[PDB]
Design a protein around this ligand. Structure first.
Ligand SMILES: [Co+2]
Ligand SMILES: [Co+2]
Ligand SMILES: [Co+2]
Ligand SMILES: [Co+2]
Ligand SMILES: [Co+2]
Ligand SMILES: [Co+2]
Lengths: 280, 280, 280
């Protein structure tokens, strides 16, 4: 190998997060008061890392942080039921852990935290977090296995009801790369409907990393994937590999989803910054 | 290895089954007259076993047994079309077979019956079994490969329209285990709608067994899975592994499905029987 | 091995295709003027082959050819946006390429074009091709890896809205084989709804080829698969393996989809041509 790969994990990391009501009426998470986004910021860790998240709810309603895939004790579940949500103006420290795979005492193989995951609110609107998630309380989490290939850049695409990342229909979002960049996509689905994500000009492996380790992986290679509420997946592509520069559409392939909005552009540039067939 | 594993199969097994109308108006299967359940009882066999099911329809309407995945001749298809359904008060012997994987004469690999499957009616209401399935005529079937890890216990969760196992919304069902128990879940979906099954605090492999054989399996590890009508899957988890005791929610992650019902508790206890943050 | 396998690819192939309005009001593709079908004809190539498609639009509206999975430059995307659609009476040469898998300079593994793919219009009705696809502008593409097992025959099944291959409900289509034939199914979904495809009496591997290479592939073996708009998959079965001759139903397992239409027969014959329990 010669590409950047993830190191072995096992550090204790500390992080501040905030839930905020935004001027537009949405609700979002951020690492800093006043810099909440929808989607929320990317959290990336190595298998074995522990994360202590000092979470503050600056809203006038109860809110939580619930994560998928990672190890948390019931005190960090982030639900009303376990009293692990947070009162208005409150602060709580959530802890997320991750583990490497390995042999159990009984000889079986324990899986490993690595994968494409996400966090979201589990209490706003309803005690399953319907209002919070609808308003924008969700974000991606990546957990890397030692040896995993690292990308040049990560972009997050979220199908939340009939929006991409809670934006008005036909407003992208658009992402840019240069031919040959190693680009990582985290795809999260929220809300009420099933979707199909499609990319023109590229393809990936339907497995944990979205890439093939080598010629023995029998995983389907696809350009199209059905996702439902709270699914998360990811993959890496080489931008323009075998196909060259261009404004490569990605869309919710459900044909009315694409007709009313839910289309974005993966703008893949030559070194000079131009894109054949696309007028800036 | 040190955990219980499935032995080699090849026994001929005999079983009585009944379709019954229940006092509540539902229809269910059972091994004994008067002990029908919804879901129907678990059938578990080893690859290579043959099963002769002496099926009796005690209802006033035609009924059948149709199974997925296992080997049956067209005479055991369980449909009106092949005249393999059963008249009211009638009896029919269905035969299901299973085979081990192996090399064909041409050098190719023949798959193997092993997996998480299910049986259901294929004729009540309509000749596709819409009324029967809606009323409760469905149940799980497990076929084990020699060497497969055996669980401490198996629980069946069925998303049938907007019910879990045909129960009234918000009535679970709830399942119990102790920290460290090897728990098996069979998840079957029936009816009209697509669903996402989600478990808090646990994860499994999106492959045949729901577990990783070791570090070369590239299967996605998930905590969330889209299922549609007549899908079946299963997996095993170590209860509370890396996360400890607690009332761990499972729910149809479609956010209106969770709001009106379709939530249950995986109650994971310490040895003393207590569950932190949960009041009995 | 002893069964026919795909050779190494790398030929340049030339093909004429037409989009035509049909007498019934549908729109279809064909290799010859007057022989358009719905679905469109099968294109099959070997990894490394290049295809130059001389496409002519004989309709009174703009049309295109867009393919999934294969390598194309943005000039063959087949969309209004890149001006790669085709005016009424126009002709355009689309080029599709395919590549073998292999090691990149950086040591990573590049996937490979092989798989079950499809082509469709991307501009009729809307600039996402809603009218074209609805009317019948879609067809299957197969790309084979060197060494892939070759079938005796390939059949294409398309769930397009609430039709199979744009046929009136309950009109099949029906497919025939003899016990022991190696049959290939290409399953494509189009339109607005999610579906489940189910086959009685047979099963396949949820991976690239739909078959297991041997005993180390941990892929789920299934008889049921959720598909959404623009999904494509395929697999091979041995007709009647372990189950014998019969009229083996396949259907959209969504129970109202099966009630109103969306059921077909895989007619598996003994050498004498008879099918037990089926009256011609
Ligand atoms: Co939840
Ligand atoms: Co969740
Ligand atoms: Co059926
Ligand atoms: Co069925
Ligand atoms: Co498209
Ligand atoms: Co497409």
């Amino acid at each position: 190998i010669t590409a950047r790969t993830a190191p072995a994990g096992g550090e204790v990391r500390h992080l501040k997060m905030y839930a905020e009501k935004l001027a537009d009426g949405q609700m979002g998470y951020g690492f800093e008061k006043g810099k909440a986004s929808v989607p929320g910021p990317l959290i990336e860790v190595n298998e074995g890392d522990t994360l202590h998240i000092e979470f503050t709810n600056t809203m006038d309603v109860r809110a939580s942080l619930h994560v998928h895939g990672l190890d948390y004790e019931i005190s960090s579940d982030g639900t009303a039921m376990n009293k692990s949500d947070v009162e208005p103006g409150g602060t709580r420290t959530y802890t997320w852990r991750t583990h490497k795979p390995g042999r159990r005492d009984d000889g079986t193989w324990r899986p490993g935290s690595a994968g494409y995951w996400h966090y979201h609110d589990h209490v706003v609107g309803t005690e399953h977090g319907t209002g919070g998630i609808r308003n924008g309380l969700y974000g991606p989490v990546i957990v890397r296995r030692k040896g995993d290939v690292l990308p040049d850049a990560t972009h997050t695409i979220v199908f939340n009801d009939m929006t991409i990342n809670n934006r008005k229909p036909h407003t992208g979002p658009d992402f840019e790369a240069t031919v040959g960049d190693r680009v990582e996509i985290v795809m999260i689905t929220h809300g009420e409907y099933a979707h199909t994500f499609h990319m023109h000009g590229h393809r990936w492996a339907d497995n944990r990393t979205g890439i093939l380790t080598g010629p023995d992986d029998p995983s389907r290679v696809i350009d199209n994937k059905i996702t439902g509420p709270a699914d998360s997946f990811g993959f890496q592509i080489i931008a323009g590999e075998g196909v060259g520069a261009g404004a490569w559409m990605y869309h919710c392939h459900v044909q009315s989803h694409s007709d009313m909005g839910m289309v974005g552009l993966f703008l893949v540039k030559k070194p000079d910054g131009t894109i054949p067939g696309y007028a800036a």
